[model samples]
Target: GSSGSSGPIDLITVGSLIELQDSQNPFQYWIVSVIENVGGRLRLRYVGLEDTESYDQWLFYLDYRLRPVGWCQENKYRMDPPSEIYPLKMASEWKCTLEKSLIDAAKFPLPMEVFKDHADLSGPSSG
Candidate 1:
């Protein structure tokens, strides 16, 4: 039992692309089909992955583990399969930023002193 207002109205809509929330497997993005208001509870359907299945698969809106993808608006457009290496690069960049922040904090203990110290440290190498 869940409140309808607090549920998936904004997130899941017709023509929207979605994947299972926190999914490990790269399931192809699902397109929302129908949204119904049945006794104040929302129900929805999406195109089934199985080609042999004749009917669209239905689920309670809350039960559907849908997540938004970048290319939802235009169904005709195809997206490049997500790169596994991209996340690793992003994680590496984040770690570098974190390490730099720690070193910067240790070098300039006061927040006010960071501006002056950072300029001096970065200015020569920046050229």
Candidate 2:
């Protein structure tokens, strides 16, 4: 058996994307939406819901193992996994949106103020 987080587990914030680990089929990737934490567990929502009735598919944190998948930049959040990782149904919907947003954000340069803040806060001399 393997553990997801070996050391200290940092609480994932709400609205972040996470990968649902399939122990039975390790190669498959199932990305889900983070609703919030409930009673020391995570409440996960489906990224692409077919209809209102299907919302019941959402499950509690303990129901499925999770892995973080994304990089947040000054402009947008980028999904880390390749497009093929997602199922065909979700590849065009939720996955496409995430990919497009990241590409679009890349067009805009990072603001000088943010760059300065990063340098000042994380600079070597300040350490």
Candidate 3:
């Protein structure tokens, strides 16, 4: 999604559970409970907990951001929730997962530039 007047893009990378830990003020428990209730299993392979800060921070960030969003967006429920609306953080995280999954599934190994041009031509204000 466009950053909504957030100024020019510096860069975008996938956020992680740790990053999310900081961000999820009230929803972390709810999210975890939901995932558990739904039997969702997150397979965190090769987590380099002991690596140097730079290696851990930069190398894994994109993959973390990419993987879950990729998964959540593809699922139908994420797009059209049964309810009219949801808490902003929950909905946003769900949408992010779905979008990331879609990008990953395409198998088109390109950077974000490839995706940028296809954004909605009609800006949000047009409708």
Candidate 4:
């Protein structure tokens, strides 16, 4: 197993639960309930808590900040709360368990660099 973004890139379809970082704040993260895909855009809402009447926002399919659940742990990036959108609180090394749960369910994630088109993840806009 490698320690970077490797392996066959998976196709992200509906019900694809994933680790999605905030639009502007890279440090902010959340476990997404990807309810719909509108013309290659993602509609995200907090899973495991409130699948609220409204969704968060529509993210492009190839947004760099969006990654699989175990991504933060692999890269050691700390994140914000609900983040996982978990229920229970306190000292919960919550992610590890949740990540494994997704694994057990045979649900996998899109690559961290899925956006960049086979390389050159230098930045978002220019390239």
The candidate scoring highest on TM-score is 4
Candidate 1 weakest ten by summed lDDT: 110-119
Report backbone clashes per prediction.
Answer: 0, 0, 10, 1
- Quantify how close model 1 is to the true structure by its C-alpha RMSD in Å: 20.2
Model 2 over residues 1-127: C-alpha lDDT tens digits?
A: 1235532222344554555644455454455555554443556544554233344234454343554443233323433333433454554676665554444334432222221222345536653
Give per-residue CA lDDT, model 4, range 1-127, as digits (tens): 1132332223455667767766555776766656676555677665443434544666766676566666666656665545233445433545554554467335555544544456665767865
* Poorest 10 consecutive residues by lDDT, candidate 2: 109-118
CA deviation > 4 Å runs, candidate 4: 1-10, 82-127
Q: What ranges in model 2 sit over 4 Å off?
A: 1-10, 50-64, 70-91, 97-127
Residue 43's lDDT within candidate 4 is: 76
lDDT of 4 at 112: 44
lDDT (Cα, tens digit) per residue for candidate 3, span 1-127? 2233332122332222211121233222111101111111222211222222221222222222223223333542323322212342376655565455344435433244412433457746755
Per-residue lDDT of 2 in model 3: 29
Better of 1 and 4 by lDDT: 4
Give the number of the best model, judged by lDDT. Answer: 4
Superposition error at 66 for model 4 (Å): 1.7
Model 1, C-alpha of 68: deviation from truth (Å): 2.4
Ranking by lDDT: 4, 2, 1, 3
Residue 101 alpha-carbon offset, candidate 2, angstroms: 8.0
Tens-digit lDDT track of model 1 for 11-110 = 3333333333223434433333333444333343322322323333444444435433333335724322223322534645434533443343344332
Query: How far is 103's C-alpha from truth in model 1 (Å)?
Result: 46
